[PDB]
Amino acid sequence: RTLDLPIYVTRVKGNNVYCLDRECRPRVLTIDPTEFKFKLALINRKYDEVLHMVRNAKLVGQSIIAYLQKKGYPEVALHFVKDEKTRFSLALECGNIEIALEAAKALDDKNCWEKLGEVALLQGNHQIVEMCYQRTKNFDK
């Protein structure tokens, strides 16, 4: 759940959440945990929750960086993710090469490709990789 100007967490009184900036700038709070559910949930692959919440950041400065940067599944990608550029970043970060494929189609930042087909190969499929390279002018290759 998000704060409300300065607050400090003092400690936790039950579910009816309580928060303090020091002695004012205060909360009673309907909760909304994140994480707990999550590394357990995650640990059991489970998404249902997040999803269900429809909770969806990954950036605030960043926010993918707990371990969503050091990703845990691309199932994560699925809860949230955006622009082809962003998507692309994911395409490396996850290595989401599904998103890459399209991403690629949509990339056209060469270098980007340029590494990537190999990488793609590296991960698999040269049947495809050949194409990738085909426009890439690694003709000789």
Binding site: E118, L121, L122, Q123, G124
Partner: protein, 101 residues
């Protein structure tokens, strides 16, 4: 242009000298020497590629080599990244029975 092995051995020696991977290969080939091509790869870290040769024209290093490549991959864990089989399963190597030996 006229062609020559002898030139090639000395040159091979040279080939070793030159410092970019690629020429040396042609040589190795040119001589006819898978072995040489493959050894060369070991130094450069040509690994995916090395596997193709090792497969195509079979010195069955595909088995040997694949394990190592896979190991790198392995280092960079994820099961898909690991990737596994030689005679049977994922690959059926010698059970496939097809065109390089």
């Amino acid at each position: 242009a006229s062609g020559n092995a002898s030139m090639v051995n000395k040159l091979a020696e040279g080939a070793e000298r030159d410092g970019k991977n690629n020429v040396a290969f042609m040589s190795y080939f040119l001589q006819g020497k898978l072995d040489a091509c493959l050894e060369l790869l070991i130094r450069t870290g040509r690994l995916p590629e090395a596997a193709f040769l090792a497969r195509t024209y079979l010195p069955s290093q595909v088995s040997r080599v694949v394990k190592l490549w896979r190991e790198n991959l392995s280092k960079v864990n994820q099961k898909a990244a690991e990737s596994l089989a030689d005679p049977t399963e994922y690959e059926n190597l010698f059970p496939g029975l097809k065109e390089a030996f």
